[PDB]
Scaffold this active site. Structure first.
Site, short mmCIF file in Angstrom:
data_model
loop_
_atom_site.label_atom_id
_atom_site.label_comp_id
_atom_site.label_asym_id
_atom_site.label_seq_id
_atom_site.Cartn_x
_atom_site.Cartn_y
_atom_site.Cartn_z
N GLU B 141 0.76 -1.19 0.11
CA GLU B 141 -0.06 0.14 -0.05
C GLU B 141 0.83 1.22 0.20
OE1 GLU B 141 -3.01 -0.21 3.19
OE2 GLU B 141 -4.18 -1.54 1.95
N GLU B 312 -6.68 -8.03 -0.55
CA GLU B 312 -6.95 -7.99 0.90
C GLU B 312 -8.68 -7.54 0.94
OE1 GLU B 312 -5.01 -5.21 3.29
OE2 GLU B 312 -3.14 -5.64 2.34
#
Ligand SMILES: [Cl-]
Ligand SMILES: [Cl-]
Ligand SMILES: [Cl-]
Ligand SMILES: [Zn+2]
Ligand SMILES: [Zn+2]
Ligand SMILES: [Zn+2]
Lengths: 644, 644, 644
Positions: B141, B312
């Site tokens: 991320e 995710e």
């Protein structure tokens, strides 16, 4: 006379002659230029390039326009900031600010004092004797972007010098500040630091002196430039452009060194930032609150000892408020005539043409980026045509005086004691109350003679010096003192006699306790004037006097002895209006219950009526009155002028 | 295919074989590991300990599971940070951040570039050729916790290099930024600093270039790793896990270096942070707003050139939002099938087992800390069983395209001009309008071909480059341009022709003024489409065209010429729906007025219906339709799939 | 016994004899002085000036008054701070604070430890043997102005020492904190830094240990002074003045080193800062919330092992809250009698006379700045006269115990998991529920024997140690555990058995999931006790037990097994009252449904009734009861005392 703020350095030279011609055709007489041109005048250190400025001035002069030159110290060049990092200011958080915007300089920096001296002297010697140059504007909006107060090393050392000059000895400072408290005692001025980043709150006397010092540094910085202009530009006026709702800088004091005061009006921007009731925020989004420009015209007319200019007038939407609406159709013309009605010698629009680049690319001008005339152009041209046939009578003394004080703003900023206590809010409340009664107002400083006024209103004057007391004693009409007046000594202490301190020589009463109350907690104060639910601030008065208004617990809310009145609570708009109306009637002054959006201002025997909308209203003109402009029926965003 | 994020380094080795077995039994095919393992791989400087990782990989592989290795650069070890303090980033306030959490590194640090190069090369050479390894996730991320933008010395120097490469000469930069304004003129790139801590606002061109630079540095940092993986791990895919509602990083640009895009979906967390109306915030607290995951699936399918994964997927309550409710019963299954319906190749759950220690101990997993299966486990297992019997048809081109641009987000972040102007808010408003009509959407970048689309919606595209204009010209169906489109040049200036700039070659109209309005100030714009009270943003359009919607003052709110439409005001959800419905009808597209909580997504000739609750609803299936999953009556938090 | 806080160093010496005389005439017995006098005792480094203090003490003693000397370490002199800059603390933002207010020192500074040692030893040796001196107050309100937690270099190094002492080895710390997470692994204690300015959130175990450390440093700093006073001032008591709603400092732990606890009560200030419902904020603006002082009297009576003083009692308006109303007529007397009813040995007013200078010039005293007695003086004098004829019965054990824990406050501060989760709010909710039932309360720490209590309430106890579990096992009456109890291990990890951890040896249930919900999201939990809409926090309980209250989805909200109850949701005031009332009835305790503004407190067989207004109410006295003070009809801001 109408003018405009112009930036020849933002446009191709080929456009200059055209711009100058169009300025003349529009009916403009003055053009301000140069306040942000240092980087263009001295792109390389020590290498001046006057060529383009000489040409711009010549081009404007050829059209018969008068030039107002702004000294370029508001925006120092990057090469200068790089050479002297000390020029950059430090914020309250202790962080050094950076180049990139504007006003990135410290008023205490000895280096910048010399650099300013150098460039201003060069500018003054070169253009100071030109017939085309009418005068100068020093710098640009001192203090904007929270720049009056700096916390850098230079300011910490200068503050010590200021303190020694003020107190003489550290012993006197310790007594004045009451440093025995929390073991703040200083052995010397060298031990005193700036009042920020302290654990717990800083000493109020300490903070107030710092605010006084900060304002004084701005005045000193400005004085240096004024002296240069007096010596090298004799006969040319010197002014500065002040801001709306700004109190960090004592304008009354600084203007003592100017020929007249100038200010920058952006009604829509100020209004969006104001905590107006839900309904009003929407109603006045495109017009500005009815009293926002007017209050400042009156304030600055006073700051300028009767003379002022609107150096910058909003001509369309701006870029800096949370919301930036467009002025409604006719509002630019309305704001202009309103400024003139309040005595503005010149109304200058910011700016000639909307810039297509940088920070203010969304700030409208009289012309769009493509040079096509914008809505403001036509409204400004209309005013020029109307004013040409409407030479104005002289400004007469207003029937009511409102005593305003910058020091008071500092004291309440330091010690609000109640989260909702607002000095400007209190002043504005009283101002609006007078305006809604159709009364003209003169804003004056403490000590100014009140001779000739029907009555005077002092929203709040915490420190009452001999000069102010003298003026009150000599007043020919009643004087109303607002809450917290006379509550502090010059050193930010409670007077030995308790509030209202020196005023007890006029009113036999003492404030023995004060209360700040949460929003919503109201209690009715009643009497002959009416019933008024009041809150926010309440004072307990010990006095032999019978209160004119009494709370439910028997405590007085309003007192009077002779020509002096004392308000012991935060006023509601309703109370302010009824009390002021009663004072007007007593003084033989006629009043009118004007509707929400209508306002009046006199100029000699003439009366101007401004309708902030949204619907048409009738001008309260006497029968048979002769209308010079408009008609009795005033449409929204329009006005009327008549011989009353 | 379903997967899971696993952390063998958080559990006793004796648990690994059991975890791997249970992952297989659950029906999972992929397992991601290693992105936060640097400290475990190199606990001592220069001393690598691959043992445990070799074993973890072998253990997973033995169960037939495919491993996705994350490079460990998101969390550098303390010994490394101690060795090189320059690795730590500096925030906008000018403060150096510290070790203790994650993402504590600067994308410009030359030292970290080399350290990343070293560890990634080691990882790639060791595992790059293993059959068990399917691919890699670079870092983790990028940008989370506001880490795209750093203001340290390394970034200030790198920015100068970026500027010189972009402009060539400082003269070109001065012209592009309009530095004559406020005397910002630079003598060289060496004089340019980062745009923060300025007095007053920084130059918009300056800030935009800094944002472009920051995003570019992330891409460069990532490119280094991609090159290493291509050279030492040939045949293995490379992806990155993007975030919801995150625009600091240009995902379209960075994904050009990836095989496909991946993203992390946490509907409840995003939803709690969204400014939804009172009623919706409560209704969707445990389900997420109906369009929050879907918008991102469509966005990232586009970012990945048609290919994407949900790396995710939320399986229970999270730890990071102000409020962290539990997903309602069935929502994990719903979100999973929704991801698959929108084209996700793999849906991977974060995480296998809830950690009992550290920052995310309150973040649920498929299993509780005591290893007992949690609610998400059973829902995931059910989907695995259902998908096994439901091989999916291919994803087809959607009927409508929505043009999204990261640069647009930066421009509006820099210059909102109105406090309520929100780029993502505007995009989402249009997206939801399309979704409520039952239409599928493809999110594409500027320049992407619009061939095949019934029509296209461009929420707002401030800068319109030739490639984008070309795509619009070649569009086979209508194209709707939202407010502020074509309002800026590549250098953040107002186009010479004024907005909509380049688009004027398609639409003969000019935006001569814009207004941002306070909340609550509404005005009706009316016409054949209906009556719509609009506010927030309004533009004044000068054009020979007859507006389709007109405000009360006669100003146009919506214009059209040929296949191009221009919306000159902030749209209300009602206007967006009616306008989009009209465009659909014109294009021969059938639409449905779906109730608030129902959504549809097609996959080939199949249609998926998702009910976000709280009550049951009927799936708008054709008569005689064959249901593959569920029934026509869709219960809350449930779904249905049928052959339409 | 009544006392007062006095500052002889703020007044001319000629006033001292008069002040002392008036203190005696008022009926006062104790006078606290000296806590802020360091700068006056040592104006010049090394040059002590005891003269004035010797005289002040002698003057007070001559009137038969007992002196309480405060050690002067709360406010070190500027010359000392200048000599040792390291004394100044550093805030969470990483900024060094400055001199100017108070409490500007770091608890870890080795230099300040020695300077404190020096001045306290001097003070103790000089006055420690005087008959006039009754005892000492160490420093002044440790932690006020957010000063428990400092982030300077001295604290970073001391924290490492604290960690090594706590864990022994870095290996143990890594395991305790779960540092494998996000690669936080440390090679040594030297690599550990303070938990601030991290990217993303700091490790909860890390932050909790820092908070424990910070509190421990305050205790160590205090212990040094206690030891000095024990050695040089034998027989003289030592206490410290704690604050309202302050948890940064573990008062239970620090008080272990004191003879008794003292606290500073300012009901109006605390109340203005409390998030009370609209109606209550107005109703109690001048009285304080009915339970605000009482909760703290009970808390500090417990902190002091049964003995406590109110060292500072509000006598009029204060200066530090957003709103500072005046106490209603009679409230100073009411607060005083309430303190005495709750067991205060002495109630001391802050302060004797309102200071006319510095930071607290707006803080009222018993006398106005002009020395005239203020409203508080007359109320205090009345209490002195009433107490003289009302010797009080001894304080008896309360029927209900409330277990309070400072560590719990730290855990929830670190990990709220829900924005509205508030430890003090939860504690206060239960406390008020008990108070509204007319029940007396004893606040005790974890581990304290619960023998003799009808029942006990544990708002929330995250970490349940053996000592606490032992006390619960030996409880003779039921024990109610609030949500999140037993949810964390000593190292801030989720127990292996899951919450409620150790409590599962008492209650066969497990919390398998928790939810934090947005405000407004309510769901009814129902059963024999009633129907209660609950929200904010909800836990999923896995248990064979039949819940007493069940939500609409069948999940239990309240459980019980034997004498132990567990509440699995945030309680509403209604639920708290009904549940506590049911427990009271079961225990054979009589309860009363007291109206909103009435409160009761027993002292032996006597009952005190306090009416917080705004209207009169009847005291629930038994028939034929004998009134010692007041009458059955209790007017607002008044009280009654009778033999029940
Ligand atoms: Cl211009
Ligand atoms: Cl895991
Ligand atoms: Cl005193
Ligand atoms: Zn400075
Ligand atoms: Zn950096
Ligand atoms: Zn420290």
């Amino acid at each position: 006379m109408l003018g405009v703020c112009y930036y020849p350095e933002h446009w191709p030279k080929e456009r200059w002659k055209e711009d100058a011609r169009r300025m003349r055709e529009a009916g403009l007489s003055h053009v301000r230029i140069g306040e942000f041109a240092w980087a263009l005048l001295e792109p390389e250190p020590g290498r001046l390039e006057w060529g383009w400025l000489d040409e711009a001035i010549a081009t404007l002069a050829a059209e018969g326009l008068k030039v107002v030159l702004g000294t370029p110290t508001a925006t120092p060049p990057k090469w200068l900031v790089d050479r002297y990092p000390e020029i950059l200011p430090v914020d309250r958080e202790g962080r050094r600010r950076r180049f990139g915007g504007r006003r990135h300089y410290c008023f205490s920096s000895p280096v910048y004092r010399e650099e300013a001296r150098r460039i201003v002297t060069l500018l003054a010697e070169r253009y100071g004797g030109l017939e085309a140059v009418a005068g100068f504007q020093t710098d640009n909006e001192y203090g904007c972007h929270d720049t009056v107060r700096c916390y850098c090393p230079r300011c910490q050392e200068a503050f010590r010098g200021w303190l020694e000059a003020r107190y003489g000895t550290i012993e006197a400072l310790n007594e004045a500040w009451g440093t025995a408290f929390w073991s703040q005692r200083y052995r010397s001025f060298a031990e005193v630091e700036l009042p920020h980043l302290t654990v717990a709150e800083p000493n109020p006397s300490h903070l107030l002196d710092y605010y006084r010092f900060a304002s004084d540094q701005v005045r000193a910085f400005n004085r240096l430039q004024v002296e240069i202009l007096r010596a090298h530009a004799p006969g040319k006026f010197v002014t500065h452009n002040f801001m709306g709702f700004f109190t960090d800088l004592d304008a009354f004091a600084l203007a003592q060194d100017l020929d007249f005061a100038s200010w920058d009006s952006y009604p829509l921007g100020f209004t969006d930032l104001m905590p107006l009731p839900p309904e009003e925020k929407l109603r006045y989004a495109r017009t500005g609150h009815p009293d926002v420009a007017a209050f400042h015209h009156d304030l600055y007319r006073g700051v300028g000892r009767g003379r002022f200019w609107v150096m910058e007038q909003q001509p369309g939407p701006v870029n800096w408020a949370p919301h930036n609406p467009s002025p409604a159709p006719g509002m630019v013309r309305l704001w202009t005539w309103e400024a003139l009605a309040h005595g503005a010698e010149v109304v200058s629009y910011f700016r000639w043409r909307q810039a297509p680049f940088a920070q203010e690319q969304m700030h409208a001008g009289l012309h769009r980026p493509d040079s096509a005339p914008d809505q403001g152009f036509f409204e400004a041209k209309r005013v020029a045509e109307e004013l040409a046939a409407l030479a104005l009578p002289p400004v007469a003394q207003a029937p009511v005086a409102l005593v305003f004080d910058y020091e008071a703003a500092w004291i309440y900023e330091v010690q609000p004691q109640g989260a909702e206590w607002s000095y400007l809010g209190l002043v504005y409340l009283f101002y609006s109350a007078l305006r809604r009664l159709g009364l003209d107002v003169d804003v004056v400083p403490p000590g100014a003679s009140l001779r000739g006024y029907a009555f005077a209103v002092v929203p709040s004057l915490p420190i009452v010096r001999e000069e102010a007391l003298e003026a009150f004693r000599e007043a020919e009409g009643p004087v109303l003192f607002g809450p917290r007046s006379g509550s502090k000594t010059e050193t930010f202490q409670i007077p030995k006699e308790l509030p209202p301190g020196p005023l007890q020589a006029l009113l036999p009463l003492k404030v023995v306790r004060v209360e700040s109350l949460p929003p919503g907690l109201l209690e009715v104060a009643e009497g002959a004037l009416g019933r008024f639910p009041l809150g926010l601030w309440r004072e307990w008065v010990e006095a032999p006097l019978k209160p004119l208004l009494t709370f439910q617990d028997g405590k007085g809310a309003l007192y009077r002895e002779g020509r002096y009145l004392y308000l012991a609570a935060w006023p509601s708009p309703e109370l302010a209006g009824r009390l002021l109306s009663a004072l007007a009637a007593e003084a033989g002054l006629k009043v009118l219950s004007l509707p929400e959006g209508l306002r009046l201002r006199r100029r000699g025997t003439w009366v101007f009526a401004f309708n902030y909308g949204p619907e048409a209203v009738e001008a309260p003109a006497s029968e048979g009155a002769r209308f010079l402009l408009g008609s009795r029926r005033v449409g929204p965003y329009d006005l009327a002028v008549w011989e009353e």
